[PDB]
């Protein structure tokens, strides 16, 4: 589909209807609101179309600070109001709710089932413990969302006991869905908590996810990797990617 969209940018160089241009800008806004990134050849067409504006293919510093503008890429951290927005509408089972509310916030919410079943070679009671042990080395509060299945041999427990002594474990019924509990416990704990597993808010969810998801651990950046603009500038990631199209005018 990106292939088709690119072709309309190419047509844009000669089509100087400024009503046509604002439909091309709508595409850019669609990319932003849905965490999509153009291909490299699509990026070239965007740069080229805008220049009919100065474009440069660049990278982003550790506190980017784009190498091209010197401008600072949008922050990945949610504002207190933005976070209280996204939080409210995700919660929009009471044993779990109780479990959370009678306890201090957590730092990492771990989807035990999906984490354990991702490196299929090793036993999954072992894999969970390994993830927990590496994280408990820094004294974080850990909530492991598990199932009654984990406390039934054989998921050697044994090994689950070592898990429960370094992480807090809530064992939901085996039929329960994973996503609701993880989203609740993480968002309830606060903007600081991370996890392992409308248009403005769907964007917020995407910003929140990118800045709070621990990927097996991958580093979380200071800045937000999305198509973005300030009016005088556009910053478009392409080909999360690390290459950026820099536009300023
Ligand atoms: Cl697509
Ligand atoms: Zn730049």
Description:
Helix 1 (2-12) runs antiparallel to helix 2 (18-33) and helix 4 (80-90) crosses helix 10 (199-212). The protein has ten helices and eight strands. The protein has a domain at 80-211: Rossmann fold (3-Layer(aba) Sandwich). Helices cover 43% and strands 15% of the residues. The protein has helices at 2-12, 18-33, 40-50, 80-90, 94-101, 112-116, 124-136, 159-164, 178-189, 199-212, and strands at 54-58, 108-111, 142-147, 168-172, 194-196, 228-229, 233-238, 243-248. Strand 3 (142-147), helix 8 and strand 4 form a beta-alpha-beta unit. The strands form two sheets. A four-stranded antiparallel sheet has the order 1-8-7-6, with helices on one face. Strands 4-3-2-5 form a four-stranded parallel sheet, sandwiched between helices. The chain has 249 residues and is of the alpha/beta class. Zinc ion binds at residues 66, 68-69, 71, 235, 246.
CATH architectural label of the domain at 80-211? 3-Layer(aba) Sandwich
Report the biggest beta sheet as strand number plus sense, adding barrel if it closes: 4 strands, antiparallel
The CATH class of the domain at 80-211 is Alpha Beta
N/C terminus separation: 29 Å
Number of helices: 10
What name does the CATH topology of the domain at 80-211 carry? Rossmann fold
Proportion of residues in β-strands: 5-15%
Computed Rg? 22 Å
Report the helical percentage: 40-55%
Structural class based on helices, strands and sheet pairing: alpha/beta
């Amino acid at each position: 589909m990106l292939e088709t969209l690119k072709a309309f940018f190419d047509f844009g160089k000669d089509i100087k209807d400024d009503n046509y241009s604002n439909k091309l800008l709508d595409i850019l806004s669609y990319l932003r609101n849905n965490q999509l990134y153009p291909g490299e050849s699509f990026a070239h067409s965007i740069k080229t179309w805008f220049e009919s504006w100065k474009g440069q293919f660049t990278t982003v510093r550790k506190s980017g600070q784009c190498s091209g503008c010197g401008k600072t890429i949008e922050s990945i951290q949610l504002s207190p109001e933005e976070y209280e927005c996204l939080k409210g509408k995700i919660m929009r089972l009471k044993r779990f709710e109780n479990f959370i509310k009678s306890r201090p916030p957590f730092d990492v919410v771990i989807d035990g089932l999906n984490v354990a079943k991702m490196f299929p070679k090793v036993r999954e009671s072992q894999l969970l413990l390994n993830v927990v042990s590496q994280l408990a080395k820094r004294n974080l509060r850990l909530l492991v969302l598990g199932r009654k299945h984990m406390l039934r041999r054989s998921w050697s427990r044994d090994e689950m006991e070592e898990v429960q002594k370094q992480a807090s474990c809530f064992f939901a019924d085996d039929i329960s869905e994973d996503d609701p509990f993880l989203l609740y416990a993480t968002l309830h704990s606060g903007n600081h908590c991370r996890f392992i597993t409308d248009a403005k808010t769907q964007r917020l969810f995407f910003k929140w996810q990118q800045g709070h998801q621990l990927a097996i651990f991958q580093r979380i950046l200071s800045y937000d990797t999305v198509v973005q603009t300030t009016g005088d500038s556009w910053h478009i990631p392409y080909d999360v990617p690390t290459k950026w199209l820099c536009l300023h005018q």
